[PDB]
Design an enzyme around this catalytic site. Structure first.
Site, mmCIF file in Angstrom:
data_model
loop_
_atom_site.group_PDB
_atom_site.id
_atom_site.type_symbol
_atom_site.label_atom_id
_atom_site.label_comp_id
_atom_site.label_asym_id
_atom_site.label_seq_id
_atom_site.Cartn_x
_atom_site.Cartn_y
_atom_site.Cartn_z
ATOM 1 C CB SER A 129 -2.405 28.056 -44.356
ATOM 2 O OG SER A 129 -2.068 28.775 -43.164
ATOM 3 C CB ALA B 40 -7.308 30.524 -48.703
ATOM 4 C CB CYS B 41 -10.731 32.326 -51.275
ATOM 5 S SG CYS B 41 -9.689 33.133 -49.973
ATOM 6 C CG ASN C 207 -13.124 34.270 -48.687
ATOM 7 O OD1 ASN C 207 -13.514 35.373 -48.940
ATOM 8 N ND2 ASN C 207 -12.136 34.064 -47.880
ATOM 9 N N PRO C 208 -15.338 32.210 -46.696
ATOM 10 C CG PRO C 208 -14.770 30.126 -45.745
ATOM 11 C CD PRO C 208 -14.855 30.868 -47.071
ATOM 12 C CB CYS C 209 -12.548 35.444 -43.370
ATOM 13 S SG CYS C 209 -12.136 33.947 -42.383
ATOM 14 C CD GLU D 197 -10.327 36.633 -46.887
ATOM 15 O OE1 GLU D 197 -11.478 36.290 -46.478
ATOM 16 O OE2 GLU D 197 -9.322 36.029 -46.557
ATOM 17 N N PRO E 261 -7.494 37.795 -43.041
ATOM 18 C CG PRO E 261 -9.227 36.550 -42.099
ATOM 19 C CD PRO E 261 -8.525 36.825 -43.432
ATOM 20 C CB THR E 262 -2.647 37.392 -41.895
ATOM 21 O OG1 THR E 262 -2.777 38.365 -40.810
ATOM 22 C CG2 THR E 262 -2.778 38.021 -43.293
ATOM 23 N N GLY E 263 -4.522 34.915 -39.828
ATOM 24 C CA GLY E 263 -4.467 34.262 -38.522
ATOM 25 C C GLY E 263 -3.217 33.436 -38.279
ATOM 26 C CB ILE F 8 0.779 33.670 -42.908
ATOM 27 C CG1 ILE F 8 -0.271 34.712 -43.239
ATOM 28 C CG2 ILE F 8 0.504 32.369 -43.624
ATOM 29 C CD1 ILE F 8 -0.415 35.039 -44.809
HETATM 30 O O1 LIG Z 1 -8.828 27.153 -40.991
HETATM 31 C C1 LIG Z 1 -8.930 27.875 -41.978
HETATM 32 C C2 LIG Z 1 -8.509 29.205 -41.915
HETATM 33 C C3 LIG Z 1 -8.638 30.005 -43.040
HETATM 34 N N1 LIG Z 1 -9.179 29.481 -44.254
HETATM 35 C C4 LIG Z 1 -9.335 30.347 -45.479
HETATM 36 O O2 LIG Z 1 -8.281 31.410 -45.556
HETATM 37 C C5 LIG Z 1 -9.019 32.688 -45.664
HETATM 38 C C6 LIG Z 1 -8.048 33.612 -45.005
HETATM 39 O O3 LIG Z 1 -7.639 33.100 -43.751
HETATM 40 P P1 LIG Z 1 -6.256 33.583 -43.029
HETATM 41 O O4 LIG Z 1 -5.711 34.697 -43.856
HETATM 42 O O5 LIG Z 1 -6.544 33.850 -41.578
HETATM 43 O O6 LIG Z 1 -5.439 32.115 -43.068
HETATM 44 P P2 LIG Z 1 -3.807 31.807 -43.051
HETATM 45 O O7 LIG Z 1 -3.384 32.106 -44.695
HETATM 46 O O8 LIG Z 1 -3.084 32.794 -42.011
HETATM 47 O O9 LIG Z 1 -3.556 30.383 -42.739
HETATM 48 C C7 LIG Z 1 -10.385 32.395 -44.953
HETATM 49 O O10 LIG Z 1 -11.403 33.387 -45.207
HETATM 50 C C8 LIG Z 1 -10.743 31.067 -45.580
HETATM 51 O O11 LIG Z 1 -11.144 31.264 -46.973
HETATM 52 C C9 LIG Z 1 -9.611 28.120 -44.310
HETATM 53 O O12 LIG Z 1 -10.079 27.630 -45.347
HETATM 54 N N2 LIG Z 1 -9.469 27.313 -43.160
#
Ligand SMILES: O=c1ccn([C@@H]2O[C@H](COP(=O)(O)OP(=O)(O)O)[C@@H](O)[C@H]2O)c(=O)[nH]1
Ligand SMILES: Nc1ncnc2c1ncn2[C@H]1C[C@H](O)[C@@H](COP(=O)(O)OP(=O)(O)OP(=O)(O)O)O1
Ligand SMILES: Nc1ncnc2c1ncn2[C@H]1C[C@H](O)[C@@H](COP(=O)(O)OP(=O)(O)OP(=O)(O)O)O1
Ligand SMILES: O=c1ccn([C@@H]2O[C@H](COP(=O)(O)OP(=O)(O)O)[C@@H](O)[C@H]2O)c(=O)[nH]1
Ligand SMILES: [Mg+2]
Ligand SMILES: [Mg+2]
Lengths: 615, 610
Positions: B91, B133-134, B307-309, B311, B477-479, B481
């Site tokens: 993201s 992200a991390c 980092n938080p999740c 990975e 997690p890719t919540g 994307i």
């Molecule tokens: O609200 C959020 C969601 C995710 N993350 C970070 O993105 C990592 C992976 O999250 P995900 O792959 O679900 O996020 P997306 O890239 O789909 O937005 C997490 O462990 C965090 O380090 C964050 O900082 N805030």
């Protein structure tokens, strides 16, 4: 009488049993084994004296040959003066003096002391030999700064200091940021991080200005923020606010870096404050404007906030160390002994000036600030008990005039000393740019209540050239050191004349010493129980008038007489004054507002109110 | 099939109505009045493609006179791969690429771009241009370092996710040679962090080693710290802890700056961890020791947190940017199109590696730890949907062998891309002092379930000379994307086949392989009961294949995590889902198994918990 003769009358009197519990508790030093390095007040006196005397090295006026026996003069005086408990510095000075120093220098008999000993003391003072109590730090509009301030609070607290801030720079809740684009949380929110920090580094001052858009929510922010005292900031002139009020005008709430705008009736804003103070004692008023009016460096430097109890208006990163004379022990045959009080002011201002030299701060913007101004806080305690000895009712006028005079004398000789010192030791750096230099008839307080006024003006004149300190005086609450001293606190009236301490647990029934020394012993025993049930003398049969009128307590004294006593003292104090305006249970919201308005027409620099039975 | 044909299959398949809603809410850039600068996924793709292409400015192997051509070829390959949703960066890359850059520049046609245009993009990147992200930050045992850390949390969060290991903090009650006090404890200190984050608008990682004196209080610290995921750190070898548990031994709690010490039964401790996980899902387990085992920079650098999740395990001040390939888009007549996949993997690695050079960090020591390591997190999404198309049940050995080969192939080609960028642009500053250099046969994952192992061994050998990155792979997690991409999440099975979330989905592969009308018929039941399991008059073949999270037992969950982790150099985000009727012993049983497998951490969530 001579200081030396008064010292001899006090020096072999030990603190009472109640002070001693206090001393063993947090004041006597303990070696890392958890053991005792100090077992008696005397020792603390020895430690502190020695270490504060140590600043005489830095004295450009001394040569050598002379330097040793010289520092051995000041150590003895400082020593004698604190053993007697005639003058006591703020707690930090007493906890932290000589932390870092070798355990055999601090207490070794004085005539085993060598010049190199005192240099070693100078050098071994570690990063927790923080000897001051009041600090202010800013909190700019930025995150980097907000969170740097939270760090600053922590560190100042680690070392035993109390700190405050004006938060008015923080743009209101709801603001645009980019930044981030999430919306600004607001100052009331960010103060939670401050609150949470201190909850974990085991009181703070939080001020927001009256014209901030979030003010209404701040006024309400403890209905939580439990480590905060909160006051409402008035940076404009008092007269301006009083005017607006009496016209029923309106106030524009706005902020530089936001588009949030509101208009509110000032009477309503005041009512909101009054009600919450009526309810719980917060928030106070801080008349920032008025503090600047008397600030030597304004507008170059600015006073934006007080420390936790309001008694020092401090500029950014500025700290201030304090200590207090027990004017109760200067009672000589119906008079305050001015001859012994003068020498001691002389002595006290040098002592406190010396503290700064041997001090260590967690944050060298604060070291800078301090070396630049050298602001002190000489004050007094034992004043109510002195009123007792002199048979002056606190709530009188006689009392306020006497107060104004006492304070005026002290102010005089305090500043004359800042003079003799700025000569002997060199001016506080920023003299030149101060109203002492570029002004003319600059006086750091209002005056108008004493004969000493004209001598004071001269001196502030002789001060256009020689001056160790931007300011010199305050009145602290002296919550602990007045305990240590066995005397009433700061300028406050005694809250009670008698109460019950429990031994650790047994009925030890304490009566005020002076009440004992004056009222008939038989009478006392009769009334005792009733005095402790009612907490006052006034409604007690068979106690003579003389005595009920003299031995008034805080609740016997009406709000207005409190306010006006604070005024008398503020008139000869350059910093501020810590004073609770006590109100009876039966007081109303209106009664609070009326206090507030009066406060506006007087020379008080802030307002704390406390309604009996509030909390 | 060549990648570019693959691209032509997907480039014009419009994001679904659901995906498009999400894009508007938070991805499409808005101008300074909340007007829309971007209205189509294509605009995002252009902007991100171009910003990241710009990194090619700093390519030492290009002469100033070929640069414009090369930069545009990368923008174009990046752009297509992204519009097609074959690969998507994390993201932050979507949100922030292009911030500080003149609008007339971000979306302009590639044909029209000059060398000066790219240069203007590179040089006008502002302090919000944060694409990662991390993060992990140290929290040392001083007031100084504790509140510095808190300010960093503030700063990273203001632009970003962050984790710490709080184990440096002397136990509650400890002697403070500072002052009168008594150290407050890691747990209380973490409240400051939660409070800071409650107030800075942007989830946090909090870790405490199993053998820190405060661990029991830690394990309970959410039976508040509402912003933390918590994990137990196991800095020591997984084997050692398994043995202790099997021997019913005792673990000493101690701290190098405290006299506080205590003995505890590892079993009672584990059962306490498990009891809480059973109720609430916290704390998870972080096998720090096992992360260091595969950490090319150990013992000179060390991994103390994720980092938080969970990975990515990271060293102090290290940051990592993520990106994922949608493997379901690679399905072709019974197979994974390995030709196409390999090309995307080479592109995805360069893309992620370029993100570093155009990334701006809010603290200079992160800038430095990132420049020095260049860690990437290339992962996958759409794995479950892929299995559906392949008619492979998620809970079978068939799926897990498939997973290992699949992930092994990706690992292979990614490290091989890293060599190539090493050669083309220069090794990651600390190549010279890492175990890819100073040691023979070092491999940064356990391998052991693919025919590709040998090949991986020698790419690792080659990587002795050239290597752009200390590490390349994760499964995130890719919540969000995976929503943008209309595919399943990470390696997770689909949680539900049909479900309304805030409205209606229905699995697209199921739509495609199920008899319609007898979808219409059953559709009501599935949508409420949450599985196909106990619906009659549906095969059987469909039932076996179209399993969801709760149809798959915890061990099948955990072993799929094992299968992927053998071929991932970082860690893996996997939830071990348990049915409501599972027991505290079922959870201990997971942990015990976790310890024998190659998993690097554990997260459990019992259906019905929170
Ligand atoms: O609200 C959020 C969601 C995710 N993350 C970070 O993105 C990592 C992976 O999250 P995900 O792959 O679900 O996020 P997306 O890239 O789909 O937005 C997490 O462990 C965090 O380090 C964050 O900082 N805030
Ligand atoms: N992410 C955030 N969430 C909530 N409030 C924030 C956030 N970021 C900043 N603020 C508050 C903190 C200050 O009160 C104010 C200024 O933030 P700051 O960090 O200075 O941004 P900035 O200075 O980069 O942008 P601006 O130019 O808008 O000030 O907004
Ligand atoms: N006032 C306090 N209240 C609670 N905890 C504290 C306090 N002061 C320090 N701590 C905790 C925070 C850290 O975990 C730990 C270290 O404090 P720190 O500031 O490093 O002391 P120090 O470094 O000056 O001396 P030392 O490290 O030798 O004990 O003590
Ligand atoms: O427990 C305390 C009491 C006081 N103060 C600070 O010290 C100043 C002086 O307070 P006081 O004289 O009451 O303290 P003492 O030196 O008698 O202990 C206050 O206004 C606060 O700034 C503090 O930090 N902690
Ligand atoms: Mg700013
Ligand atoms: Mg330390």
């Amino acid at each position: 009488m001579k200081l030396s003769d008064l010292i001899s009358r006090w020096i072999d009197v030990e603190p009472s049993k109640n002070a001693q519990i206090i001393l063993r508790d947090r004041y006597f030093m303990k070696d890392l084994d958890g053991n005792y390095l100090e077992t008696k007040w005397e020792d603390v006196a020895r430690r502190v004296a020695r270490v504060v005397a140590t600043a005489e090295l830095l004295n450009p006026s001394y040569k050598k040959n002379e330097k040793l026996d010289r520092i051995k003069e000041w150590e003895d005086i400082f020593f004698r003066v604190l053993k007697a408990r005639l003058f006591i510095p703020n707690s930090p000075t007493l906890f932290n003096a000589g932390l870092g120093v070798k355990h055999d220098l601090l207490w070794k008999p004085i005539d085993q002391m060598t010049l190199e000993d005192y240099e070693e003391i100078y050098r071994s003072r570690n990063h927790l030999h923080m000897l001051s109590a009041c600090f202010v730090v800013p909190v700019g509009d930025s995150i980097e700064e907000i969170f740097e301030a939270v760090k600053e609070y922590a560190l100042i607290t680690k070392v035993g200091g109390g700190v405050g801030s004006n938060f008015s720079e923080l743009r209101p809740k709801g603001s645009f940021v980019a930044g981030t684009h999430g919306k600004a949380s607001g100052p009331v929110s960010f103060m939670h991080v401050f609150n949470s920090a201190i909850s974990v580094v085991k009181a703070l001052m939080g001020i927001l200005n009256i014209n901030h858009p979030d003010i209404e929510e701040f006024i309400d922010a403890k209905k939580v923020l439990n480590f905060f005292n909160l006051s409402v900031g008035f940076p404009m002139d008092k007269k301006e606010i009083l005017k607006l009020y009496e016209e029923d005008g309106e106030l524009e709430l706005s902020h530089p870096r936001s588009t949030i705008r509101k208009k509110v009736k000032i009477r309503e804003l005041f009512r909101k404050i009054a009600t919450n103070a009526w309810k719980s004692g917060d928030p106070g008023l801080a008349f920032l404007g008025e503090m600047n009016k008397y600030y030597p460096l304004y507008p170059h430097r600015k006073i934006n906030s007080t420390n936790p109890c309001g008694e020092i208006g401090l500029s950014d990163y500025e700290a201030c160390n304090l200590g207090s004379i027990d004017v109760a022990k200067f009672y000589n045959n119906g008079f305050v002994d001015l001859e012994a009080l003068q020498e001691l002011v002389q002595i006290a201002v040098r002592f406190l000036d010396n503290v700064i030299d041997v001090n260590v701060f967690p944050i060298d913007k604060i070291t800078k600030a301090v070396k630049e101004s050298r602001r002190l806080g000489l004050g007094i305690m034992g004043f109510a008990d002195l009123l007792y000895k002199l048979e002056i009712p606190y709530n009188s006028q006689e009392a306020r005039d006497f107060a104004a005079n006492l304070m005026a004398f002290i102010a005089l000789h305090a500043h004359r000393t800042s003079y003799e010192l700025g000569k002997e030791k060199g001016n506080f750096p920023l003299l030149e740019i101060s109203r002492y230099r570029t002004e003319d008839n600059f006086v750091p307080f209002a005056m108008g209540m004493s004969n000493y006024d004209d001598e004071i003006r001269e001196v502030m004149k002789m001060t256009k050239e020689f001056r160790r300190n931007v300011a010199l005086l305050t009145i602290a609450p002296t919550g602990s050191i007045s305990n240590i001293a066995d005397t009433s606190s700061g300028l406050e009236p005694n809250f009670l004349l008698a109460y019950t301490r429990f031994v650790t647990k047994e009925p030890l029934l304490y009566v005020n010493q002076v009440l004992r020394e004056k009222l008939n012993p038989e009478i006392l025993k009769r009334i005792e129980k009733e005095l402790i049930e009612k907490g006052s003398l006034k409604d007690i049969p068979d106690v003579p008038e003389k005595i009920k009128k003299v031995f008034v307590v805080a609740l016997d004294i009406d709000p207005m007489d409190h306010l006006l006593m604070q005024d008398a003292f503020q008139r000869y104090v350059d910093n501020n004054i810590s004073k609770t305006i006590n109100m009876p249970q039966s007081a109303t919201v209106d009664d609070v507002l009326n206090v507030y308005l009066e406060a506006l027409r007087t020379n008080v620099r802030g307002i704390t109110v406390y309604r009996d039975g509030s909390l």
